[PDB]
Design a protein around this nucleic acid. Structure first.
Length: 79
RNA sequence: CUCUAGUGCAGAUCUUGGUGGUAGUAGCAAAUAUUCAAAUGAGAACUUUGAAGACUGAAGGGGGAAAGGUUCCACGUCAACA
């Protein structure tokens, strides 16, 4: 595990306001690829409600996540 | 061995049909956010189910007549066809 930061600044600047956060969760998918080096990407409904609580126009910038490597044999699920 | 007829095709912005052409290009149906997990499986964003959010609520709620007429329903199939 690392305890990570997810700064949701860029890719949220230039995207529509009322449909901002559905593009922002797609960045939570991107981040998992490089910084672990995994084939599969996996989130949870725990990370759906990690943004959406303060909904779409407002967002969490300081959205600091966790990650853990297994599922089947190896894969990183953000958990 | 000689007589007889609906008797020679390139064409009236024609006529009987396939095939070419733009072209695998545009279109892909009025701007009401979607994210994530499962059931089943040969294949799953779409069936179906759960977690969660957008959305409307003088109607996305409710409900009768004309008109149509079994399209509902359960059962049952993935070929043509969306």
């Amino acid at each position: 595990t690392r305890e990570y930061t997810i700064n949701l600044h860029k890719r949220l600047h230039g995207v529509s306001f009322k449909k901002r956060a559905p593009r922002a969760v797609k960045e939570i998918k991107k981040f998992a690829k490089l910084h672990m080096g995994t084939d599969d990407v996996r989130l949870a409904p725990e990370l759906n409600q990690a943004i959406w609580k303060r909904g779409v126009k407002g967002v969490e910038y300081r959205l600091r996540l966790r990650i853990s490597r297994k599922r089947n044999e190896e894969e990183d699920a953000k958990n």
